[PDB]
Design a protein around this ligand. Structure first.
Ligand code: 3PE
Ligand code: 3PE
Ligand code: 3PE
Ligand code: 3PE
Ligand code: 3PE
Ligand code: LFA
Lengths: 605, 504
């Protein structure tokens, strides 16, 4: 278990080597370095899990050095490992290893190969730092590393200014959420005097026995940081534009690293959120609203990648609902299963966009099952797991546990919202699948596809998270009650896919009747632009920022301090009018001064 | 004992590099490099022999080294030098920045390089003397003496593409600002000395004797106002800030002048050393105005840096924002915020030094500085865009670099003191990320917007790459292991904080 720091050291070494290589190395050597770094991280993680289960699942701590030490401010470089940290360490390492294999096949002949692999290695290292951190400041270091690597990888094609604008907007939105996280850090250190999570859980109910407003503020700011990183309300707008990057970048962001950081922050500080029930209720409400809005947005999207983005938004909203109903185990189970099938869907979409020309609309594509059937069945199982198809997909069991935890704690409305979201999820997923793959035609990568094919089924559901002794157990349900909820969820999913097949498989006449209707056009244009959130954030934040910058670009304070210079020049030019060179005026001025001096002497005598 | 040599070795080296020009025109750069190496080695030996990690706070005065020699005994004026943790850290930073400034002017083989290097040596010696003098008249003397070579360097060796008259205007605005503010400082020094003389009856100009002075409220407020006006011009603090982009834009193209005396934060050292201990009640009353001026400086510098089409003016406004952060930290009264201010000072010096050297190299490569005439420089340059990305990431407060560490202890201490200033400054950090990304995407990303950026450019030499990688390594080490720097400056910061809070 002593090799816990190797999971950070090896991706850091790979990133440094591939950054200082500067593309001088061959493609095979760069691929070997990057994929081998992430694979050695995965192997060290596997050995760590073996040794973790061999010792009876005990929480381990590995300190390296003390980061900062000023008075009571003591922050250290201590890694921690419990069941949750091991769970998403395994998720991040394995999914990143598969994505790195797929990207090593995918980016052959691309400019920036070593730079891409260095950035992804730094992404992996930052997320391992995030999930292994014992305190909030080291987790903040991993948090900002995740944000910076996402910004660098989204705008990987730096020649296109749209990619750069998308990366800049994603970095700004994540940094606003990161500022909210720092607000939580400042409040927690000011109240408790420590930043270690276990020490907060120990010393919080004693300190907050009388007043709980500051703990409420800290948990609210933690929720703000979580919705900033996990793309929820009100900081969700960055993902659809962040889609503009490469495909394995999207797979790493939506499956392994970026969107799971908020869920990690909610689940790791579960004690502090348990001390603030209203904030946890707000987490559940935010998750429900985000999943509903994401489904309604993805129903009308005209691209595969945007549909997958809003599907990621909806499933992160599902996880936030699970956290809000105190179903933590269901949230982490859905975390790993959604990582598997969303990685599969994104890699399959990248294969599709490689096989079918350049980027195109979904209505351009049709009947693609015959030409590319392997990635068609990859899309089929990934959409079945996304839509929670019963008895064959791990997503069904994950959403089943989420909804069982939702209704087991009295959250009826959140369960209803989750069922409606599952219905809409099946609707948009099979709408995209039937539009793209049905109609009329117009070894490096096969192994990760095979692994994500297997893990998207119930084989992924066979993996039980080792979360006993870390997160509290969800309250159990009556067997008939969860049987009824299971059959209701299966009925909802099956009627969703049946409605999608009735609407989009054949000649879309009922679909084009709704779409070409004026209220249908209005609702489609509303949902297609992310419910006008980007428009509002441009008109409320971006536009006055640009206006203030344009107003201030002449430096008004510099002119306000240049006022006495122009006053001095004007006064000097005015005083130079007395020196006209006339002797009679000089004698007159001498007499004038004589009268002035004399009169001043007598009035002040 | 070593402190007089720490001051006059730059002066003697400047004299020798002026006088050695007849032996060859490539000689004075070697003399300047050797002299700055000796100064930095003396500072490092003082760091080793000081034992600063094991030094505890014992109260002002507490100097790990001292020196005294009478200079004008009529007024009780002596050349009085002293070193402790914070002063030695700033002297080491000055030596390192002077070494980088000498190495950054290696390729200038012009016919009057001896005067250039003598002026550089005199600037660095004046900065060291400012960091070392605990006699108020000597401190003011160094404070104004380090600016005449700056004026002559800007006005004569400045931006050769620009006309001379613009350089004259910029250098004259800089010198007028600094000298008028320092004249207000000298008036404050004289009035404090006369208050001491009326109270006790002995002529003195020593900071140790001027600490324990009996005085009323309102005169102390005016005296602190004079000191703060001088430091706020030098810091800079808005609206006394336009000399910084005016001097940076018309600086010599190597960027060594920015490293020599501009990027070394003598004003924050003066605020910590002289403004707070001599006038604690006035500083406590001025703390809301100081924090709000820092907030306005952060956001004004952010909005100016985003609006700038020029790289040097952009980095100048980044400096304005970061010293707004430091000014916020200085008046809180928290030891954590003070240590964060010291870390932010050192890390900002390193990061802005890297940014200025990279901008100078970029201007040497492309012969223009407007950002609308470049773009997509990642594909046309070998090392410069990657290091520029690292330094811009450093300036926005990214962990793994000391800027994040410094301003985060600043915000931690500030939130322990005042929450609203902290939250508004943290949105200022959002603005800082905004302007850093704006500079990166205007300069090195996108398509080429002119003809010079559409062709390949020559790469860096071993010297430039060595200096930039040294700055990168130092910034990464400061970001990940800042503990020796905190332990060096812990005693003096504790003395200043205890004096500030034990009298209010
Ligand atoms: C978790 C994250 C790990 C990686 C962090 C970044 C690594 C690169 C930069 C490191 C700079 C700082 C190193 C400091 C090392 C140190 O002093 O460790 C001390 C510790 C001994 O313990 P002790 O002295 O008691 O510590 C108490 C401190 N008050 O010593 C030890 O316990 C041993 C520590 C060994 C560390 C080895 C690091 C190797 C890094 C290789 C890749 C470099 C990547 C560079 C780029 C990074 C991203 C910018
Ligand atoms: C209910 C609300 C909940 C909170 C919501 C918070 C929303 C935060 C802001 C989200 C939107 C960020 C958009 C960033 C876009 C960046 C990309 C872009 O559009 O770049 C264009 C421009 C590029 O600059 P340049 O290269 O000079 O110009 C070339 C010509 N275009 O670059 C620009 O124009 C840069 C524009 C930057 C604007 C930054 C605005 C930050 C606002 C922070 C507000 C935080 C509020 C916190 C809550 C307060 C509650 C009281
Ligand atoms: C915080 C406020 C309170 C404390 C203030 C402390 C004082 C120091 C800080 C403020 C300094 C302000 C200096 C403003 C002028 C800077 C110098 C300058 O701009 O010079 C260039 C200018 C000529 O430039 P140009 O536009 O080309 O003119 C064509 C000439 N043929 O040259 C000219 O136009 C002529 C310059 C004449 C000399 C400079 C002006 C001195 C005026 C007195 C300054 C003292 C403070 C006065 C009160 C300040 C506000 C309260
Ligand atoms: C050519 C034309 C253009 C160029 C020239 C323009 C003008 C240049 C000169 C500008 C400055 C004018 C003089 C300013 C100082 C005034 C001093 C004063 O009025 O003092 C009165 C009083 C003295 O204190 P007293 O009450 O006697 O103390 C004993 C009680 N125990 O004091 C008190 O009771 C306390 C008073 C405190 C505040 C006095 C100073 C105000 C300064 C305002 C601007 C600065 C604001 C703060 C800093 C902002 C950032 C720089
Ligand atoms: C344009 C740039 C320059 C700025 C303008 C020029 C300077 C203006 C200074 C204004 C001073 C106003 C003083 C008003 C009260 C005078 C009478 C008085 O009450 O004196 C009190 C005291 C003498 O009586 P004593 O028995 O010594 O009592 C000890 C008191 N604790 O008196 C004393 O002990 C001495 C009082 C000294 C007061 C401070 C003087 C210098 C302050 C720094 C510079 C001015 C403020 C900063 C710049 C402002 C903006 C430019
Ligand atoms: C004044 C300029 C400061 C620049 C930043 C310096 C930051 C401190 C770096 C110290 C070295 C860190 C790496 C080696 C640690 C060795 C520890 C040995 C004893 C355990």
């Amino acid at each position: 278990m002593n090799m816990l720091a190797l999971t950070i050291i090896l991706p850091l070494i790979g990133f440094v080597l591939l950054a200082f290589s500067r593309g001088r190395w061959s493609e095979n050597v760069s691929a070997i370095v990057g994929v081998g770094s992430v694979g050695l991280a995965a192997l060290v993680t596997a050995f760590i899990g073996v040794d973790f289960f061999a010792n009876g699942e005990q929480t381990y701590s590995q300190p390296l050095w003390t980061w900062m030490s000023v008075g009571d401010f003591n922050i250290g470089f201590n890694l921690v490992l419990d069941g949750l940290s091991l769970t998403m360490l395994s998720v991040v390492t394995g999914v990143g290893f598969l994505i790195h294999m797929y990207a090593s096949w995918y980016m052959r002949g691309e400019e920036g190969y070593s730079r891409f692999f260095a950035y992804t290695n730094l992404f992996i290292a930052s997320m391992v730092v995030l999930v292994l951190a014992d305190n909030l400041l080291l987790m903040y270091l991993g948090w900002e590393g995740v944000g910076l690597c996402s910004y660098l990888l989204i705008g990987f094609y730096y020649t296109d200014p749209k990619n750069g604008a998308a990366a800049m907007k994603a970095f700004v939105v994540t940094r606003v959420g990161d500022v909210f996280l720092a607000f939580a850090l400042f409040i927690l250190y000011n109240e408790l005097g420590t930043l270690n999570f276990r020490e907060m859980v120990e010393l919080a109910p004693a300190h907050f026995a009388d007043g709980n407003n500051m703990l409420m503020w800290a948990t609210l700011m933690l929720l703000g940081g979580a919705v900033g990183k996990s793309a929820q309300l009100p900081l969700q707008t960055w993902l659809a534009d962040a889609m503009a990057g490469p495909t394995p970048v999207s797979a790493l962001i939506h499956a392994a690293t970026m969107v799971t950081a908020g869920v990690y922050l909610i689940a790791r500080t579960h004690g502090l959120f348990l001390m603030t029930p209203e904030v946890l209720h707000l987490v559940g409400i935010v998750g429900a609203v985000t999943l509903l809005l994401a489904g309604f947005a993805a129903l009308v999207q005209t691209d595969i990648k945007r549909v997958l983005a809003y599907s990621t938004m909806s499933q992160i909203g599902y996880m936030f609902l699970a956290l809000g109903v105190q179903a933590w185990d269901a949230a982490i189970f859905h975390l790993m299963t959604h990582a598997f099938f969303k990685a599969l869907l994104f890699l399959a979409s990248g294969s599709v966009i490689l096989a079918c020309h350049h980027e195109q609309n979904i209505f351009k594509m049709g009947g693609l099952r015959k030409s590319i059937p392997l990635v068609y069945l990859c899309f089929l199982v990934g959409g079945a797991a996304l839509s929670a198809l019963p008895l064959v997909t791990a997503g069904f069991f994950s959403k089943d546990e989420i909804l069982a935890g939702a209704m087991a704690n009295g959250h009826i409305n959140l369960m209803v919202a989750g069922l409606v979201g599952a219905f809409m999820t099946s609707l948009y997923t099979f709408r995209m699948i039937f539009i793209v793959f049905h109609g009329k035609e117009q070894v490096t990568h096969s192994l990760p596809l095979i692994v994500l094919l297997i893990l998207s089924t119930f084989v992924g559901a066979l993996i039980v998270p080792p979360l006993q002794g870390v997160l509290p157990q969800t309250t159990e349900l009556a067997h008939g009650s969860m049987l009824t909820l299971e059959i209701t969820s299966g009925v909802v999913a099956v009627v969703g896919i049946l409605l999608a097949a009735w609407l989009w498989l054949g000649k879309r006449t009922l679909v084009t009747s709704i779409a070409n209707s004026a209220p249908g056009r209005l609702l489609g244009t509303w949902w297609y632009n992310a419910w006008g959130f980007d428009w509002l954030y441009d008109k409320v934040f971006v536009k006055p920022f640009l206006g203030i910058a344009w107003l201030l670009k002449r430096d008004p304070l510099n002119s306000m301090m240049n006022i006495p210079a122009v006053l001095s020049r004007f006064a000097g030019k005015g005083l130079l009018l007395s020196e006209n060179g006339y002797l009679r005026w000089y004698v007159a001025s001498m007499s004038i001064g004589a009268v002035v001096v004399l009169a001043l002497l007598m009035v002040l005598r | 004992m070593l402190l007089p040599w720490l001051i006059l070795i730059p002066f003697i080296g400047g004299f020798l590099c002026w006088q050695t020009e007849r032996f060859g025109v490539k000689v004075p750069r070697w003399i300047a490099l050797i002299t700055m190496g000796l100064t930095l080695a003396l500072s490092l030996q003082l760091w080793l022999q000081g034992g600063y990690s094991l030094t505890q706070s014992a109260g002002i005065p507490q100097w790990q080294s001292e020196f005294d020699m009478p200079w004008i005994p009529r007024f009780g004026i002596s050349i009085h030098l002293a070193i402790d943790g914070l002063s030695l850290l700033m002297v080491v930073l000055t030596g390192l920045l002077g070494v980088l400034a000498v190495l950054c002017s290696w390729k200038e083989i012009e016919k009057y390089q001896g005067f250039f290097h003598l002026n550089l040596m005199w600037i660095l010696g004046g900065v060291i003397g400012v960091f070392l003098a605990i006699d108020m008249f000597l401190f003011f003397f160094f404070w104004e003496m380090m600016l005449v070579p700056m004026y002559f360097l800007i006005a004569l060796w400045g931006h050769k593409a620009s006309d001379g008259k613009t350089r004259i205007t910029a250098a004259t605005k800089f010198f007028i600002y600094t000298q008028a503010s320092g004249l207000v400082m000298l008036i404050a020094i004289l009035a404090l000395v006369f208050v001491h003389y009326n109270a006790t009856g002995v002529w003195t100009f020593n900071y140790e004797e001027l600490l324990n002075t009996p005085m009323s409220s309102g005169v102390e407020y005016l005296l602190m106002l004079g000191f703060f006006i001088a430091f706020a011009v030098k810091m800079p603090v808005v609206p006394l800030h336009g000399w910084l982009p005016d001097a940076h834009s018309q600086a010599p193209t190597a960027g060594s002048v920015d490293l020599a005396g501009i990027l070394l934060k003598t004003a924050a050292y003066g605020l910590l050393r002289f403004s707070l201990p001599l006038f604690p009640n006035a500083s406590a009353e001025f703390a809301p105005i100081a924090m709000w001026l820092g907030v306005i400086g952060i956001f004004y510098g952010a909005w100016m840096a985003f609006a700038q089409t020029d790289i040097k003016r952009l980095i100048a406004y980044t400096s304005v924002s970061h010293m707004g952060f430091v000014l916020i930290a200085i008046y809180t009264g928290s030891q954590l915020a003070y240590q964060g201010a010291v870390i932010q000072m050192i890390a900002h010096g390193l990061s802005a030094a890297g940014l200025f050297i990279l901008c100078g190299q970029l201007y040497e490569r492309i012969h223009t500085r407007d950002m609308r005439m470049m773009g997509g420089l990642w594909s046309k340059m070998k090392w410069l865009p990657a290091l520029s990305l690292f330094f811009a990431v450093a300036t926005l407060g990214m962990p793994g670099t000391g800027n994040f560490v410094g301003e985060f202890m600043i915000l931690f201490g500030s939130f322990q003191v005042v929450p609203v200033i902290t939250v508004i400054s943290t949105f200022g950090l959002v603005f800082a990320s905004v302007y850093s990304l704006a500079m990166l995407h205007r300069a090195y990303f996108g398509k080429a917007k002119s003809q010079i950026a559409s062709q390949e450019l020559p790469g860096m030499s071993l010297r430039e790459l060595f200096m930039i990688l040294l700055l990168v390594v130092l910034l990464v080490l400061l970001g990940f292991y800042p503990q020796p720097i905190l332990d060096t400056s812990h005693s003096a910061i504790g003395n200043i904080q205890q004096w500030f809070v034990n009298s209010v």
